[PDB]
Structures are given as structure tokens and as C-alpha cells.
């Protein structure tokens with residue numbers, strides 16, 4: 134009874150809230166938040182906050198790999214990373230006057246031995262857990278079919294997969310025969326996959342998620358950010374209506390949403406409860422300055438204002 | 444060998460991350476492939492230049508955490524000897540975004556040094572003093588240190604007859620200047636020189652002479668004032684020098700202060716005469732400004748620049 138989170142390209146994420154960003158000048162900051170991040174470790178930390186059994190895996194290397202291990206050790210978060218010869222990356226987010234300016238490093242190249250070695254390691258971890266949450270970019274050096282390989286292994290074992298990626302990486306999965314249990318493209322990402330103009334009408338959205346691309350995927354949950362979410366569970370369509378709140382920092386909120394989904398999947402919660410938990414954790418995060426952080430003293434209050442109807 | 448060696452001090456080093464972007468897209472995601480992460484801090488630039496010119500050098504200061512380990516690893520790879528005092532706090536990052544001709548920097552305040560660490564480094568420093576003949580001190584004090592910390596360090600050097608080359612600015616500099624234990628060399632540039640005095644920038648020889656001889660700068664053997672492209676103006680004891688310099692093509696002048704410090708410290712260590720010291724200092728500053736890298740020097744061009752510089756007693 135446990136969740137496996139997979140972060141093949143984890144990151145030491147650094148957040149810089151500035152009063153104003155001065156280009157071509159010096160910007161001074163005091164205390165700064167440096168977290169075990171990349172999408173998958175944001176998921177991990179939120180699942181740990183809620184209290185569910187979670188084990189983090191993926192690739193780490195170098196001094197920044199030790200920094201991530203350390204941050205997890207301090208919160209009592211279990212991990213079984215595969216150690217690589219390369220170096221774990223940084224990513225930066227500059228928060229300034231309403232703007233959110235991010236710089237994402239490519240990350241380390243994984244070699245043939247590490248890539249094959251990790252698959253074997255993953256097979257052992259799969260034995261254990263009852264759900265896998267896969268987040269983010271495939272790191273450089275892995276073959277394009279790497280996630281399809283992982284999901285095939287999950288399917289062979291009957292372990293549901295929540296898949297949080299986008300663009301080419303998700304496209305590759307959707308075209309392969311081994312399907313994740315849940316996918317989560319926002320409206321912008323959804324129509325990008327279709328090579329089609331973005332349209333927020335209801336009939337255009339049902340048409341969008343029923344398109345051949347998403348065949349055999351049980352849950353398709355479409356992030357509409359502050360406007361809420363639109364979701365399909367098998368043949369049933371939902372509109373998730375959410376309240377207005379005061380957003381401090383929205384980064385990592387898609388990941389907080391993944392934490393909620395995966396928690397509901399593990400515990401076999403009903404359609405309404407899954408969708409509410411998901412959007413609730415996504416909201417809590419956007420209200421915290423820290424990314425991948427949730428104030429559970431406010432969970433009940435928000436959850437109660439969410440309406441799931443379409 | 445078993446004391447002919449320079450000690451550099453970097454009390455607040457950084458792991459500097461450099462992001463060269465095509466453009467920086469604000470309020471959007473920017474992907475970078477070629478990130479460069481280096482062991483940074485003014486004192487480490489000094490150390491690196493000294494290593495290039497081939498002077499015996501040891502680096503010290505404070506380091507901590509995984510980022511402190513990164514710094515030591517970088518210096519090990521470069522074969523630069525170091526004896527940092529280890530702290531519990533974590534060494535900071537600094538960010539440089541290079542985009543569309545711009546250099547946008549984010550500078551972290553960094554760790555706080557506790558009382559035990561502050562006292563520990565001082566004891567450590569007293570031991571290092573036994574095997575060096577010059578100390579180059581660069582940069583501001585980290586958080587948590589008494590404002591008197593550089594004066595404490597300079598007192599220890601004075602007690603051993605070890606000359607100090609001091610490269611800091613503003614209130615950090617002024618605190619040293621107001622204390623009785625003096626550095627051997629300071630190098631405020633012409634704008635800093637008059638701000639320190641609370642005067643307007645008067646670039647006349649008579650004003651320079653007067654400014655440099657104010658009681659704020661009493662007891663300091665060498666005051667070397669950079670005038671940017673025009674060269675330098677200096678006082679040694681009671682003698683004044685003008686250093687005139689060739690016009691050259693500038694790539695990147697960042698780190699040129701650090702290079703001239705390396706030059707000054709090398710010259711002090713070797714007891715070079717006044718002309719040779721000022722020419723070495725300014726040449727290294729010039730060689731760095733010719734380079735895209737920061738704190739980097741092409742010694743193949745050294746002889747050619749050096750021979751052009753004129754030093755005039757004025």
C-alpha cells in the first residue's frame with residue numbers, strides 16, 4: 134500500500150521573489166527558498182504532507198543530488214534513487230511584479246548502463262506499490278520510448294499510472310499501446326497536441342478529449358487554472374467549479390494536483406472526491422510562497438466551496 | 444617547499460551559475476542547454492589569476508553544505524590548494540543571466556556565521572599566517588560577523604609583519620580605514636575615492652594628490668586608484684605616480700579589479716620596485732579586459748602590453 138513517484142530529471146529549484154527585476158543590474162535577495170523539486174519531487178513532498186505512503190525514485194548525481202537527498206531525509210521522506218555519474222540540475226523561478234520568469238536547465242545525460250540499470254531497479258520497486266506517479270521531462274540520453282517502457286511494466290503488474298507530462302513526451306506515450314491511467318494536460322497543452330486553435334466552449338472540449346489520441350485512458354483531467362477544471366472519467370464528463378482565492382505562488386500547483394489525484398487513486402475514492410481533493414491541493418499550493426507546499430489547516434474550507442457537476 | 448606563499452581570503456564565496464540566453468523571455472519559461480557553474484567570489488578570481496602567473500597561493504575563507512563541497516571540488520580540479528573553515532550554514536548561489544548584451548545578476552545574502560565559527564576561523568587564520576608572506580583580502584563580510592572582523596584579521600597580519608592587500612568597498616572599507624591596524628595596499632577607483640571622502644569627482648592632479656593624502660587614508664603604504672581606460676594614479680608613501688596605458692580593444696572588463704589585485708600581491712610577494720609593481724598590476728587588469736572570461740589572463744600578450752605602460756612620478 135504505497136505510492137511510487139518517479140522524477141527522472143529532478144531539480145534543486147530556487148525561488149527568487151523580487152520587488153522588481155532590474156535587467157542588466159544587480160538584484161539582491163536575502164533568505165531564499167531552495168527545494169527538492171522538479172515536478173515529481175513537488176508531488177512527493179505534498180503526498181508526504183497529507184500523510185500517504187510514498188517512495189521517491191529517479192536519477193540523482195553530484196552535490197545537488199546530495200542536497201535533494203538531504204532535504205528529503207529531513208522531512209522523513211523515503212527515497213530509492215539510482216545514482217548517476219552526471220550532476221543533478223538547478224531550475225530558477227524569478228517572481229516579480231506579477232510575473233513568473235523561469236530558467237530550466239536541461240540536466241545530466243544518462244548513459245546506456247544507467248538507463249538499463251534503472252529499468253531493473255524500477256522493476257524491483259514496482260513489487261511494493263499500488264500506484265506510480267510519473268512527472269516531468271525525460272532527461273537527455275534516454276531513448277524516446279523510455280516512459281512507454283515503464284508504463285508497459287506497470288500494466289503487466291496491474292499498477293495504475295498517473296502521468297504528468299506534456300508536448301512531445303506525452304505525445305509519444307499516447308501513440309503507444311500501453312496507456313497511463315490518468316493524464317492531465319491543461320487547455321493550452323490539450324489543443325497544442327491536436328495542432329488546433331484553443332477553444333474553451335463545452336462541446337469543443339468534449340470533442341477534444343474524445344479524439345482518437347486519448348483512447349484507452351481512463352481519466353483525462355484538463356486544468357483550467359483559476360477557472361477550475363474539465364474532466365472525463367471513462368464516458369462521463371465533469372465541470373469542476375472553483376472559488377476565487379488570493380494566489381501567492383502558483384508554481385508547483387499542477388504537481389499538487391497530481392498528489393491529490395494519486396492519493397485518491399490509491400484509496401479508491403469516488404469521482405467527486407478525487408476531483409475535489411485534486412483542485413484543493415492545487416489551490417492550497419498557489420496560496421503558499423513555497424512551491425510544493427500546502428497548508429492543510431485550510432483544506433476543509435476550500436474543499437467545501439468546490440462544486441462538481443455536464 | 445617548507446613561508447613564500449600568498450593567502451587569499453574569500454569570506455563569502457559563491458557557486459556562480461551563468462545562463463547565456465538568446466533572449467530572456469519575461470513571464471515565460473526559458474530553456475538553457477549550456478549552463479556554466481563555477482566557484483565564485485572576488486578572492487577566488489584573485490586566486491585563479493595568481494595560479495596562472497604561477498605564484499604559490501593558498502585559498503581560505505568560509506564554506507558550508509553541498510555548495511561548499513562544489514567549491515572545493517572545483518578548486519581540486521583546478522589544482523588550487525585551499526584550507527577553508529567549514530561552517531554549518533550553506534554557501535550561497537549567485538546567478539548571472541547573459542542575454543541581448545545584458546548581464547542580469549541575482550546576488551544572495553548567504554549564510555550567517557555563528558560565534559563559534561567566527562572565533563574558529565580566527566584561530567585557523569593565525570595558524571595559516573605562519574606559512575605565508577602576503578594576504579589578499581577581497582569582498583564584503585558574510586552575515587553574522589562583527590563589523591570589526593577585517594580589522595581583527597589585519598591586526599593578526601600586522602603582528603606577524605605580513606602585508607595585507609585589501610579590496611573591499613563602501614562601509615566595509617571605511618570601517619578598516621577608521622581602525623588603527625592598516626592594510627598595506629588599498630585600491631578604490633576614482634569614483635569610490637571621492638565618495639569615501641564625501642566630495643565631488645575632481646579628476647585634476649592637484650585634487651587627486653589632496654584626496655589621497657586626507658587623514659582617512661593615513662598609514663596606508665600604497666593607494667592605487669584606477670582611472671579606468673586612462674590607467675591609474677597612485678601614492679606610495681609620499682611619492683605620486685601616474686600610470687599611462689595603451690588603448691586596447693575590450694571584450695569583458697569584469698574581473699579586472701581582481702586581476703590587478705593578483706598583480707599587486709605577486710609584486711608585493713617578490714619585493715618588486717614601484718614601477719614594476721604598477722606595470723604588473725595594470726597589465727593583468729588589461730589582459731583580463733581583453734578576455735570574455737572573468738578573472739582570466741592570456742600571458743602570451745603580457746610582455747607586449749607591459750612594455751607600453753609608462754609610469755611617471757608626478
Ligand SMILES: Nc1ncnc2c1ncn2[C@@H]1O[C@H](COP(=O)(O)OP(=O)(O)O)[C@@H](O)[C@H]1O
Nearest residue numbers: 356358359361380383385386387412415416419
Ligand atoms: N491562480 C489560481 N487561483 C486558484 N486556483 C489555482 C490558481 N492556480 C492554480 N490553481 C489550482 O491548481 C490547479 C492546477 O493549476 P495549474 O495552472 O495547472 O498549475 P501550474 O500553475 O503548475 O501549471 C488548478 O486546477 C487550480 O485548482
